[PDB]
Amino acid sequence: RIVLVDNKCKCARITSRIIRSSEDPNEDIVERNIRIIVPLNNRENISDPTSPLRTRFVYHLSDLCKETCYTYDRNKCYTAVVPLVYGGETKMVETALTPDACYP
Amino acid sequence: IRVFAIPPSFASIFLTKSTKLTCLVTDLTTYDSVTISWTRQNGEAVKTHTNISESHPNATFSAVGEASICEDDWNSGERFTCTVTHTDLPSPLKQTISRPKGVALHRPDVYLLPPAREQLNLRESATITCLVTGFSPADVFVQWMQRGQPLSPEKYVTSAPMPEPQAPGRYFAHSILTVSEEEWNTGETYTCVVAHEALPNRVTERTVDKSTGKPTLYNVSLVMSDTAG
Amino acid sequence: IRVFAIPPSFASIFLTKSTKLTCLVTDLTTYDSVTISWTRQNGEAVKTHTNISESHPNATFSAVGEASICEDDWNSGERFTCTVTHTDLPSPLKQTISRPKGVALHRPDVYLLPPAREQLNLRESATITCLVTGFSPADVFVQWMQRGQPLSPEKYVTSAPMPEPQAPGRYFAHSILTVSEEEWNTGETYTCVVAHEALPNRVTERTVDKSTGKPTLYNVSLVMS
Amino acid sequence: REQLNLRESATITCLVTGFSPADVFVQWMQRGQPLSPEKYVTSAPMPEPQAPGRYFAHSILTVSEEEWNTGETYTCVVAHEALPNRVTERTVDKSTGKPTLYNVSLVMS
Amino acid sequence: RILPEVKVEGELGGSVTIKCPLPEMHVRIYLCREMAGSGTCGTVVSTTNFIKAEYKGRVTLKQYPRKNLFLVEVTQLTESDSGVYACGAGMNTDRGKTQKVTLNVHS
Amino acid sequence: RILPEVKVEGELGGSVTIKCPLPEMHVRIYLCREMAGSGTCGTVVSTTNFIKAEYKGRVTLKQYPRKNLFLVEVTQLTESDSGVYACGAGMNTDRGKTQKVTLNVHS
Secondary structure, eight states, X not given: OXXXXXXXXXOOOOBOOBOOOSSSSSOOOBOOBOOOOOOOSSBSSTTOTTSOXXXXXXXXXXXXXXXXXXXXXXXXXXXXXXXXXXXXOOOOEEEESSTTTSOO | OEEOOBOOOHHHHHHSSOOEEEEEEEEEOSOSOOEEEEEOTTSOBOOOOOOOOOOOTTSOEEEEEEEEOOHHHHHTTOOEEEEEEETTEEEXXXXXXXXXXXXXXXXXXXXXXXXXXXXXXXXXXXXXXXXXXXXXXXXXXXXXXXXXXXXXXXXXXXXXXXXXXXXXXXXXXXXXXXXXXXXXHTOOOEEEEEEOTTSSSSEEEEEEOTTTSOOOBOOOBOOEEOSOO | OEEEEEOOOHHHHHHHOOEEEXXXXXXXXXXXXXXXXXXXXXXXXXXOOOOOOOOOXXXXXXXOOOEEEOSHHHHHTOEEEEEEOOSSOOSOEEOOEEOOOOSOOOOOEEEEEOOOTTHHHHOSOEEEEEEEEEESSSOOEEEEEETTEEXXXXXXXXXXXXXXXXXXXXXXXXXXEEEOHHHHHSOOOEEEEEEOSSSSSSEEEEEEOSTTSSOSBOOOOOBOO | OOXXXXXXXXXXEOOEEEEOSSOOEEEEEXXXXXXXXXXXXXXXXXXXXXXXXXXXXXXXXXEOHHHHHTTOOEEEEEEOTTSTTSEEEEEEOTTSSOOOBOOOOOBOO | OOOOOOOOBOOSSOOEEEEEEOOSOOSXXXXXXXXXXXXXXXXXXXXXXXXOSTXXXXXXXXXXXXXXXXXXXXXXXXXXXXOEEEEEESSOHHHHEEEEEEOXXXX | OOOOOOOOXXXXXXXXXXXXXXXXXXXXXXEEEEETTTTEEXXXXXXXXXXXXXTTTTEEEEEETTTTEEEEEESOOOSOOOOOXXXXXXXXXXXXXXXXEOOOSOX
16 A cells, blocks of 8 residues: 555565554554565676676665666666677677566 | 578678678689679679688688668668679679568577586586577577676687577577686676667667576675664 | 498497498499399308389489398408499499408597476476597497387487597587476486497496486575674 | 585485396596596395396495595496387485575664 | 456357457557466467467457457357457457456356 | 376276287386376386285286277175276376276175
8 A cells, every 4th residue: 555665676566554453442553564676686887788797786765766777677778798700700789688678 | 512501690781880791702713803793683793792702721712792781771671682693603602692572580588597506616617508588480690798898709609590499480509608717707798799680779788697596695684773763 | 323331330330239231323324133242251142132223313223132140240341342243234344342440449428418497497308418539530329218208200310420620530429308398397307328339338328317407505694693 | 415524425326126137337427528437336236035037236436525525527328228219327415415405684763 | 447348158069259449559469368277378279370279270360450359250169168269459468468268058 | 288088887807908008019008007105106007017905916918909999807895885987008107197087896
């Protein structure tokens, strides 16, 4: 419910609710429902794979209630550029790390 | 005596920025005055060739006749013909190149497999492969690179495209490198790129290192913090 | 107007366990009353020759003859001659065919790459790749057994041997087997089995299943204060 | 593992059961190459208790402790007529049985 | 999380058509039967030529750019515990599934 | 996942024949009876000479390559409640099962 921090970069979604409990007085409960979706096998620099494996996973509930992040969005795209010899001339060519998300 | 009918490769077409069809003569005697010309399906002649090269150490001559044709006419499947005429053969020999319509266009699937674990036990080499499959019967050339500097074909070797078991006409091909084991042991992240027509941007890419292939030991630590916030 | 000879391949010899060689008659006129034989080094006769072909569009007669011969005598290094005397070839021509016994031998080495991790997301069809490297001769026989049964030759595809530029005289090949994900997702054991001349035993085999790429352990630790 | 405490000698056993007739050959190959016949020991085909006409055999290879701890693989190859390809083999090393080990480590100030 | 539940009925002679949203992206469009035993999803037909071995020749697909729609039509149904079929797009099946349906072959 | 449910009345003098698909050639075809307590399947007879202790002398097998049919024939039935019997092939038992049949013995 009250969780307008559905930022799908760090995966967080910590919503709030009130146990309409057993009909005693306002002996109610306040919750904070986290669901972090760790990529774990992803890379440190999210747009460049040459960076080492991202091992540590920091989670502050301050910046995720709005940056480097861990996963890929379906509505955004991340791209990259690559070279090649083919003999002498080297020409930069554009590739997309997110297919079916930004395919021309 | 033999004559070839070599269409420009897809890689040549979209990397050299110049589309030209060439026909090569081989296995013949080292003579001259080899009339090697390109003509169209209507019999009209095409622009001639340049830079007649030198023969082979095997005492056999080698010459090439090249014609420059734009991309759209090549995609039009026009019946181009290379004629080779010489005193060796009383009848000029004709080679036909065209684009036969009637093949569906299928996106290539390019997959990277690093060497097995027990491959890294003989401590002499690491064999990485990229396998392309399911693509349209158009045949393509492959490039590889390491740490951003691409590599020569003297090390990595590709395979001829063969039909797939269950596909009607979708093909497949392989490419492998056997590199020093210490290199792949000491990072040196490798990348296989290929260029095929069915690709949206015409070029696709994949990359592998030790980290990518089967991480056998993590220490992931989800240190949630300021849990209140 | 020729008669070529075909030596049976060790790949065919091994699985058949029977040695039979034939000579193909090309561009000889489509007429009967012909001559055919298989003379050894000592000239000993062979088994009878059957399965004579039919008429051909280019007016050629292929009087192919198959005979049964032992296995060890081939290893000895004898020579066979397909003798043919046709109406259009009155002069008898002597064919020749034998075992080379000259090329050195290096045992192959067998690798079995499982399908890529990305491939086990799209759930269409997996692909297991057997790889053979560093073998001297140009002959090698690769097949696949699932659950003790050899698979259909259609299922697996094996390419021709290809030389390594780094290793002179040595070739390599690759067999591919395409199976459904679901059978691969379930515990199923696929074995790539290879037969080759220079292997210390006549046969080697390597196998993989899903329960091989799992990580040895984790280290997850939710520090939280 | 009770054997793997003295750290003296490990004994891998290639139990072969359910085969007829009473003839079989067993070799032990490491890294693709075979081993001396004096390092491994093969028994004789004894009749099976619950299956008449069907025999069984044994085979022990004695390695030193450290090689099995380094995880070096060992291959037992069996030759017999009834085999579909006349040759079968099995492999083993340190990590055959080892399952996943979730070493967790909770902490909260 | 959409649930476009549809209750088409089909016997062996009955043919059942399933309607899926076509984003016109054309990279990949598929139907996936969720596997009750494994608890995951199992593809049945996709943009690729592959098809289930048990379902060979019995299911086909139709693309309607005029209406931006995808049709999965099954000519013959052999009393399958017709589970939940999910339409989806993209190579990754679990992440690309858009809508899910389930029906009944009997009645 | 197929459920070719076949049943019988089954007493003591009655003999029951169970039809299994012949997998073809030879691959350890067997008939397995689900163990309710363990929640898994338990072999009663296989291609090898194994026969379950309580079923000793009471079960026989007939392979029919002419019809590709595998008949499991039990001469005498009694209190052995027909729970679930699965026809299967291959080395591993739980992976190789099909005909998940169950049948009563009393009536």
